[PDB]
């Protein structure tokens, strides 16, 4: 009956800098009967706050929060390397029990471009009869970003396989990897291969191309 | 406080629907019932009371009908 | 100590049943109800339900119903989640808690994450990717290492026996067919190539594969 | 979990006989034990614990008018029938509207009308059931050492010495040994499950608190409440009413909130908190203290021989002791502290007994801080501590002579008989004779009488009290008590107990 | 409803201070008095039933100090 | 018409700051800095002390606990003025007529 959702989504923000996520519960006067839960991609989560004042044995003194009725608050002032995780919350008072569409604590740093490398399909893959073009694009950050697959000048969108991580955890940047399949008849009846990337940081797609033609 | 002592009833006028009509009959019978039902082994020696003293018959009852009206909420 | 230990990574198919073991310590098992969470596939948490576990009563959130179960065992202390006609769409990792009630819980169960899907145990197609000329761009050439159409999960694919962790990215695999292909990609200076060794090692014990590929140029 | 320093001390005369005993215990009031061969010993509840609640149902006192519709109808139509009564979020409520050829009829004084309001629930309370299983007791148990004023206040430091333990009682386990290390081990049986009644009543939560209340007057609450599950809730319409209708026009408003009249439904409610696991503060558990175990060492000790010092001055416990804490300067330790109670000083005559038996100083250390706490007796007497010139004394006066404490004994005797129910007769402790039939005469009178009539609050059974002392006055011979057999104690004894 | 029928009180072990403790002499006392303050011309009239019947004296005043605590609130 | 403003009442309230001065047995009155303040509610009391909590007496002690008083509702009453007080009265004649 009652629907959560946790806002910003997303939160790019340096450490040690107070990060006060705007919340909400549909269903009304909850009283208290507030968590937070932070959560890393592939873990189970961690609860913060219960009590909406009160921190659980594990999470440290920095992890604090205010609210009752429907609006709550996870109030962070010293947010760190550790904070950095998938932000959860879930409600209490009637039932079922259930959660809000969650949010994500990122550390700010400097915007930086993709680098991009694309692979032709190694010789093995064309003697098994397809063909993948890679196109890696490492250490960009914000997580904002495109690529496009130009076949000849023209973009294709089949085939195409987009792998890309999380903010990593020695710079703290994106890396994707981008992957074009085509079967080998199909690969050599097409000529330039590139893969445009556009990005906050480059106000132009970065444009790394080769031609079977070409080497 | 507020939940005794309430404006019931105005009494000046008012032929009207006044904010409470209808429940005003349930104000004292239905709490002092509840009360009854919550204590009947007080109710099995409540009446015994009126039975005792004075052998006039029908005025004993008139002990009794009161008396197990003061119990409740004193 | 309260630890929530899971049944680990299940592999299903969809027509099948399973029964999700959670395993609790630190406390007596009866007097903590187990709160059961799916996580979406979009990394959406959603509320399974708990088991009022005395007494032994599971109480569902109503979209899970008739399809799944909270089953337990008192004396090894081990809360069940039986599910019953998998369907592909729950694949997901699953989660258990131990009841502090209408405040949830302060622990986290280890979690266990069901794949549904209907493949065949494959090795990886683990291709050497040559870089070409316009793939060398400040004074570093980028090698990489396409992994393709393995299952099931994980694959280690480390460089040279992974002696060099430097600009190795290695990136998820999605699903193709019940099959993850996933790429690899080495960041090393334009001198180390092609004058240093610098092989992908894709290791796959799910398929008891271990791949050794080098880049060559062209 | 120790005595000191305890809202309520009371204590435990041994007249050994038994190593067991059977005691019942509370979260404020703490034991000691004093027996020949067994140490000082405290018991008291830290709280009571509960695992798994499981919950009972729950009720909306604030909700919030949204919708109004109010379908009009002619006269001899009969019923009217709004749309709204399909979904039972919809509150429905029939009616009419007084009608003249002015307002959307043909006909006069009559009318039919059925108000629909959909129900909005602001804000709701909550209750819980408590499993009997569920329910825990962490019971603080310490036994008198070489204490300071720190580790004595201190748990994990006389776990170092072995001199407290903690530990949780469950139906499951209600028998729990614990080792005192030196000291020897005891062994503690409770009774989980009938400290208590886990189904007499439940746990209300108002608001964000959560409070006691009985189970039956729990169901007896006169406001909406609700299913366990999800939707579809009774007497909604309480907390809504009604007005004239003047044509179409009728206003359902709500009422406010009711948690204040919550809060002033609650009167005897005992505030609860919560965070994992509930802890309830007075506590209600029945164990027994098997000391067999328990023993005394250092037989073969002596008097320690040199000077000592006060750490903190004496003063009194107010429960009818004594205690002081002692610095000893002298290196010749580990040894018996010599110390007495005396009653003048040309008599060396001990009088006073030992609480803490048998002080001793831990380590060779000087300047060792012990705390030892002793009962002097009545009138003037004396704090001694060692013996010849270097002893230091102190003069001490307890105005608490025996013909007060009489009364101590007996009136809060009859208050210890009072609230317990049939469980008063545990500190009867290794009876049987007067002490079983003490309690079984009372068990079926607690049973019947004063719970056949109970519920009566402050001055209802007060009150007719004196009325049915007037019944002791109109009777005849033989038959005088008869009328005033429940009068005098167990009806104006608890009216006198709570006062206020 | 919630006005009446108060939990007071639990008398279940409970050696505490609980939600209202003091305010529980100041229930009906008061919230009477101030009944019988409101309605000073029935108290003139009330305790003179109590000397019409019985002739037994003390007992007379039985039936008016339980009587005048009957009218308030019912 | 006009109606004058007679009093109020707060009907709701919440605690916010609460601030209790512990002091030992013997010490008579405890007295908290926040009485200056009229918006903190202050009330006398006592702990009961042993030589484990703060004191070094047994059996006695005072405390002053203070919280600042907020109200979150509260109720307005009106006085009617005499001459304030206005009535409609309609009045009609029943001459040729129609339902309209």
């Known amino acids: 009956d009652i629907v959560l959702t946790q806002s910003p989504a997303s939160l790019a923000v340096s450490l040690g800098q107070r990060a006060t996520i705007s919340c909400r519960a549909s269903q009304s006067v909850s009283t208290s009967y507030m968590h937070w839960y932070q959560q890393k991609p592939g873990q189970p989560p961690r609860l913060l706050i219960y009590l909406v004042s009160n921190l659980e044995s594990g999470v440290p003194s920095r992890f604090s929060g205010s609210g009752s009725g429907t609006d709550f608050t996870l109030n962070i002032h010293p947010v760190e390397a550790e904070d950095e995780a998938t932000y959860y919350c879930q409600h209490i008072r009637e039932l079922t029990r259930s959660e809000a569409g969650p949010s994500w604590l990122e550390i700010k740093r400097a915007d930086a471009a993709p680098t991009v490398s694309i692979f032709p399909p190694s010789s093995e893959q064309l003697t098994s009869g397809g063909a993948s073009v890679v196109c890696f694009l490492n250490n960009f950050y914000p997580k904002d970003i495109n690529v496009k697959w130009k076949i000849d000048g023209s973009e294709r969108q089949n085939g195409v396989l987009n792998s890309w991580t999380d903010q990593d955890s020695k710079d703290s940047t994106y890396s994707m990897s981008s992957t074009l399949t085509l079967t080998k008849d199909e690969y050599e009846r097409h000529n330039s291969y590139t893969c445009e990337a556009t990005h906050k940081t480059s106000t132009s797609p970065i444009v790394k191309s080769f031609n079977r033609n070409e080497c | 406080s507020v939940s005794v002592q309430t404006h019931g009833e105005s009494s000046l006028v008012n032929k009207t629907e006044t904010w409470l009509d209808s429940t005003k009959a349930t104000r004292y019978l239905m709490k002092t019932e509840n009360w009854i039902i919550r204590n009947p082994g007080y109710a099995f020696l409540a009446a015994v009371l009126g039975w005792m003293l004075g052998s006039n018959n029908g005025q004993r009852v008139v002990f009794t009908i009161l008396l197990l009206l003061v119990a409740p909420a004193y | 100590q309260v630890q929530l230990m899971e049944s680990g990574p299940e592999l299903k198919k969809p027509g099948e049943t399973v029964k999700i073991s959670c395993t609790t310590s630190?406390?007596?098992?009866?007097?903590?109800?187990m709160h059961w969470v799916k996580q979406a596939p979009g990394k959406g948490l959603e509320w399974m339900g708990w088991i009022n576990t005395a007494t032994g009563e599971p109480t569902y959130a109503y979209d899970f119903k008739e399809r799944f179960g909270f089953s337990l065992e008192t004396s090894a202390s081990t809360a069940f989640l039986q599910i019953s006609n998998l369907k592909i769409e729950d694949t997901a990792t699953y989660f258990c808690?131990?009841?502090?009630?209408?405040?949830?819980?302060?622990?986290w169960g280890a979690g266990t994450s069901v794949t549904v899907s209907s493949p065949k145990t494959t090795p990886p197609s683990v291709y050497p990717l040559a870089p070409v000329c316009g793939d060398t761009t400040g004074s570093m050439v980028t090698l990489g290492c396409l992994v393709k159409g393995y299952f099931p999960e994980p694959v280690t694919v480390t460089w040279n026996s992974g002696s060099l962790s430097s600009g190795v990215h290695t990136f998820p695999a999605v699903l193709q067919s019940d099959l993850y292909t996933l790429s690899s990609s080495v960041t090393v200076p334009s001198s180390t190539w092609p004058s240093e060794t610098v092989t992908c090692n894709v290791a796959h014990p799910a398929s008891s594969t271990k791949v050794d590929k080098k880049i060559v140029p062209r | 979990f120790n005595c000191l320093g305890m809202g309520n001390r009371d204590f435990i005369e041994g007249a050994s006989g038994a190593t067991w005993v059977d005691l019942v215990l509370e979260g404020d009031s703490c034991l000691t034990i004093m027996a020949n061969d067994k140490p000082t010993l405290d018991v008291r509840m830290i709280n009571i614990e509960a695992s798994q609640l499981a919950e009972v149902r729950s009720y909306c006192y604030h909700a919030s008018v949204t919708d109004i519709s109010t379908v009009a109808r002619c006269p001899m139509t009969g019923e009217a029938h709004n749309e709204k009564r399909a979904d039972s979020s919809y509150v429905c409520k029939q009616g009419f509207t007084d009608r003249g050829w002015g307002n959307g009829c043909g006909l006069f004084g009559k009318g039919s009308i059925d108000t629909c309001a959909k129900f909005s629930c602001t804000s709701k309370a909550i209750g819980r059931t408590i499993q009997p299983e569920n329910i825990k007791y962490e019971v603080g148990i310490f036994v008198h050492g070489t204490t300071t004023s720190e580790n004595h206040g201190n748990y994990s430091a006389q776990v170092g010495a072995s001199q407290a333990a903690k530990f949780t009682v469950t139906p499951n386990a209600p028998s729990i040994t614990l080792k005192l290390g030196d000291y020897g081990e005891v062994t503690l049986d409770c009774e989980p499950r009938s400290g208590l009644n886990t189904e007499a009543f439940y746990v209300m939560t108002v608001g964000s608190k959560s409070f006691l209340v009985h189970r039956e007057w729990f169901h007896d609450l006169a406001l909406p409440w609700t299913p366990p599950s999800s939707t579809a809730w009774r007497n909604r319409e309480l907390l809504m009413e009604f007005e004239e209708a003047h044509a179409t026009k009728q206003s359902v408003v709500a009422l406010g909130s009711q948690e204040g009249g919550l809060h002033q439904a609650l009167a005897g409610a005992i505030v609860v908190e919560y965070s994992s696991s509930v802890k309830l503060t007075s506590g209600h558990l029945k164990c027994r203290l098997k000391m067999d175990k328990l023993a005394l060492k250092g037989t073969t000790y002596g008097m320690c021989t040199g000077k000592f010092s006060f750490a903190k001055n004496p003063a009194d416990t107010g429960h009818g002791t004594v205690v002081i804490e002692l610095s000893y300067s002298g290196s010749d330790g580990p040894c018996k502290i010599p110390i007495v109670s005396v009653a003048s000083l040309n008599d060396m005559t001990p009088v006073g007994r030992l609480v803490t038996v048998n002080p001793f100083v831990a380590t060779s250390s000087a300047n060792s801080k012990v705390l030892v706490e002793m009962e002097p007796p009545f009138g003037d007497s004396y704090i001694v501590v060692g013996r010849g010139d270097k002893q230091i004394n102190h003069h001490w006066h307890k105005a608490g002579s025996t013909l007060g404490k009489a009364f101590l004994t007996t009136l809060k005797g009859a208050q210890r008989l009072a609230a317990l129910g049939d469980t008063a007769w545990d500190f009867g402790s290794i009876g049987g004779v007067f002490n079983s039939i003490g309690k079984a005469v009372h068990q079926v009178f607690g049973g019947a009488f004063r719970t056949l009539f109970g519920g009566m609050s402050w001055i209802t059974q007060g009150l007719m009290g004196a009325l049915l002392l007037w019944m002791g006055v109109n009777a005849r011979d033989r038959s005088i008590a008869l009328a005033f057999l429940a009068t005098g104690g167990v009806l104006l004894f608890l009216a006198t107990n709570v006062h206020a | 409803s919630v006005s009446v029928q108060t939990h007071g009180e639990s008398s279940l072990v409970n050696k505490t201070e609980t939600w209202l403790d003091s305010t529980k002499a100041t229930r009906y006392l008061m919230k009477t008095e101030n009944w019988i303050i409101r309605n000073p011309g029935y108290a003139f009239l009330a305790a003179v039933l109590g000397w019409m019947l019985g002739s037994n004296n003390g007992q007379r005043v039985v039936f008016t100090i339980l009587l005048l605590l009957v009218a308030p609130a019912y | 018409s006009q109606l004058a403003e007679v009093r109020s009442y707060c009907y709701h309230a919440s605690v916010t700051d609460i601030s209790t001065v512990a002091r030992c047995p013997m010490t008579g009155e405890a007295h908290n800095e926040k009485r200056a303040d009229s918006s903190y509610v202050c009330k006398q009391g006592f702990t009961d002390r042993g030589w484990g909590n703060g004191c070094g007496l047994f059996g006695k002690g005072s405390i002053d606990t203070c919280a600042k008083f907020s109200c979150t509702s509260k109720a307005i009453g009106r006085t009617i003025q005499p001459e304030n007080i206005k009535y409609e009265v309609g009045i009609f004649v029943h001459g040729t007529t129609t339902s309209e």
């Open positions: 808690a131990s009841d502090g009630r209408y405040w949830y819980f302060g622990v």
């Open positions: 630190g406390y007596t098992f009866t007097d903590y109800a």
